[PDB]
Design a protein around this ligand. Structure first.
Ligand code: HEM
Ligand SMILES: Clc1ccc(Nc2cnn[nH]2)cc1
Length: 383
C-alpha cells in the first residue's frame, strides 16, 4: 500500500505538504539556508557556517522536520563547498554542521549530500492550499543564487514527477490483473500508465518558460554537483568530527527519481542489467533515494514480468498497450535529450574555450543515449 512505501496517491514519491519551518532551536540553520543568495553574494556564507555551534538533531521529532532539516543542511553544504561557483572550493565541512548532518543522514538512510528527494520532493509549497498543484500556485523553499532559476528547475522536475507518479497507483492493479488472469483490467491499467507518462511529457514543456539556459548552466549546475569522480574534490569531502577520511558522494540527478526507474523495472526495460556505466549509475542511485522508495523499486523486481505475460498471450491489444507505455518513456527521453542540448550543450559551447559531465557524475551524452536506446529496444513493434 501507499502507507508501506510512502507513495502518496496525489503526489507519489514527493513528500506531501512539506514542512516550511523548523523548531526555534534551529533558527541559526534556517537563517543561513533562507539567505544563501545574500550570504554567497556578500562573501559571508562560509563565516556564518564556521560560526555555528553544534546543534543536536534530537529536537526534530517527526519525518517532515527531519526532511526539512536535511534540505536546509544539504543546501548549506552545497553553498559552503562550492561558494560563488567560480573555483574557490572547501574540502572540509566544519564539524558543527557535518556532525548533525551525518547523524540526520544516517537516521534517514540517505548520504550526507543534497539529493533529488530533498531538493525536488521536499523543496516546495503551495501558495494557496485551496488552489491545485500547478506552477502558478507553487514555490520552492530554498534557492542558491538570485536568478539561478531553481524555482523553475525544481518545480518543473516536481510537476513532471507528480504527473508520471499518478500511474504508480495503477501498479498493484497490473500485478493483481496478471495474477487473477484478468485480461481487460490489465489492458486498461497499461493504457492508464501510458496516458500518465504522455501527460508527464506535456508537463515537461513548461521548462522553456521558467528556466534560462545561461542561468541554469553557469549558475545552478554548480550547486547540484557532487564529490564523486569530480576533479575539484578528487578524494571527496571531509565530514569533520564524523569520519576521519574524505568521503565521495555523487551530485544530484533525476537518476535518483524513483518514478522513471520503477516504470523501467515494471516494463522489464532492464536499465540496471549487467555491467556498463549506465546500469551501475542507476543501481548506485537507489541508495540516494528514501529507504521506502528503494524498497518499492526492488519489490517490483521480485514480481513476475509484465513484459513476459504480454508476450505469452498472442493479444495485439495487450502488446499495443504495453508498447504505448514504452513509447511514452522513449518520447520523454528523446525530449529530455533536446533539453540537454539547449540547457547544457549550447551554453557549454559558448564558454571561453574530456566528455560533458552531468551533476550526477555521468558522461551524460553516452549515458542518456544508452538509457534511451535500451527503452526503444524494449518495443515489441516499431520496425
Ligand atoms: C534543464 C533541464 C534538464 C537538464 C539539463 C537535464 C539533464 C540531465 C542530465 C545531464 C542527466 C544525466 C545524469 C547526470 O549525470 O546528472 C539527467 C538524467 C535524468 N533526467 Fe534530467 N535534465 C533536465 C530536466 C529533467 C526533468 C524536468 C526531468 C523530469 C523529472 C528529468 C529527468 C531525468 C531522468 C529521469 C534522468 C535519469 C536518466 C533517465 O532515467 O532517463 N530531467 N538529466
Ligand atoms: Cl538536487 C537535485 C537533483 C536533481 C534535480 N533534477 C534533475 C533532473 N534531471 N537531472 N536532474 C534537481 C535537484
Amino acid at each position: 500500500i501507499s502507507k508501506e512505501y510512502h507513495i502518496d496517491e496525489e503526489v507519489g514519491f514527493a513528500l506531501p505538504n512539506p514542512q516550511e519551518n523548523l523548531p526555534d532551536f534551529y533558527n541559526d540553520w534556517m537563517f543561513i539556508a533562507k539567505h544563501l543568495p545574500d550570504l554567497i553574494e556578500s562573501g559571508q556564507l562560509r563565516e556564518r557556517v564556521e560560526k555555528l555551534n553544534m546543534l543536536s538533531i534530537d529536537h526534530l521529532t517527526d519525518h517532515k522536520s527531519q526532511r526539512l532539516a536535511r534540505l536546509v543542511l544539504g543546501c548549506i553544504t552545497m553553498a559552503y563547498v562550492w561558494g560563488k561557483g567560480h573555483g574557490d572550493v572547501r574540502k572540509v565541512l566544519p564539524r558543527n554542521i557535518a556532525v548533525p548532518y551525518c547523524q540526520l543522514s544516517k537516521k534517514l538512510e540517505l548520504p550526507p549530500i543534497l539529493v533529488y528527494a530533498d531538493c525536488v520532493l521536499a523543496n516546495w509549497k503551495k501558495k494557496d492550499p485551496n488552489k491545485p498543484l500547478t506552477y502558478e500556485n507553487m514555490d520552492v523553499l530554498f534557492s542558491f543564487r538570485d536568478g539561478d532559476c531553481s524555482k523553475g528547475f525544481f518545480l518543473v522536475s516536481l510537476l513532471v514527477e507528480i504527473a508520471a507518479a499518478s500511474a504508480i497507483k495503477v501498479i498493484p492493479t497490473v500485478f493483481k490483473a496478471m495474477q487473477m488472469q484478468e485480461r481487460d483490467t490489465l489492458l486498461k491499467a497499461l493504457l492508464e500508465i501510458a496516458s500518465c507518462l504522455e501527460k508527464a511529457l506535456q508537463v515537461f514543456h513548461q521548462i522553456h518558460d521558467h528556466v534560462n539556459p545561461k542561468a541554469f548552466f553557469s549558475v545552478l549546475r554548480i550547486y547540484l554537483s557532487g564529490w564523486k569522480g569530480n576533479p575539484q574534490l578528487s578524494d571527496g569531502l571531509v565530514y569533520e568530527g564524523f569520519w576521519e577520511d574524505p568521503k565521495e558522494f555523487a551530485g544530484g540527478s533525476a537518476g535518483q527519481s524513483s518514478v522513471f526507474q520503477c516504470f523501467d523495472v515494471l516494463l522489464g526495460i532492464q536499465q540496471t542489467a549487467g555491467g556498463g556505466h549506465a546500469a551501475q549509475f542507476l543501481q548506485d542511485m537507489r541508495r540516494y533515494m528514501p529507504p521506502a522508495h528503494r524498497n518499492f523499486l526492488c519489490s517490483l523486481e521480485s514480481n513476475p514480468s509484465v513484459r513476459e505475460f504480454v508476450l505469452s498471450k498472442g493479444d495485439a491489444g495487450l502488446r499495443e498497450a504495453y508498447d504505448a507505455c514504452v513509447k511514452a518513456l522513449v518520447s520523454l527521453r528523446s525530449y529530455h535529450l533536446q533539453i540537454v542540448t539547449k540547457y547544457i550543450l549550447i551554453p557549454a559551447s559558448q564558454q571561453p574555450k574530456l566528455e560533458a559531465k552531468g551533476t550526477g557524475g555521468t558522461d551524460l551524452m553516452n549515458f542518456l543515449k544508452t538509457v534511451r536506446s535500451t527503452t526503444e529496444k524494449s518495443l515489441l513493434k516499431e520496425g
